[PDB]
């Protein structure tokens, strides 16, 4: 969950409020939809989407079960508005 994911990740909810029908396919299935993006998606990770406005998306995306370590550039990158993996 570095800096360049985390770009990715802004890019995909970025074509979401511009993009209804991409929109409505990451919600309906975010794993079909990660997977067009070239990101792994791990059966062991949840995933969940927690605003689907015209305006604003928020796609929440846990860490792999492969995570490193991040820099503080790294977890400033991260968006501070999501949520974690379910326990």
């Known amino acids: 969950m570095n800096e ?16 209804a029908e991409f929109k409505a396919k990451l919600i309906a299935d975010p794993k079909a939809t990660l997977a067009a993006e070239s990101i792994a998606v791990p059966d062991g990770i949840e995933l969940r989407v927690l605003e689907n406005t015209a305006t604003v998306v928020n796609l929440v995306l846990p860490p792999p079960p492969a995570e490193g370590e991040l820099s503080d550039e790294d977890l400033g990158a991260v968006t501070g508005g999501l949520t974690v993996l379910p326990w």
Request: aromatic share 12%; proline share 0%; hydrophobic share 30%.
């Open 4 to 19: 360049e994911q985390t770009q990715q990740y802004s890019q995909i909810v970025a074509k979401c409020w511009a993009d």
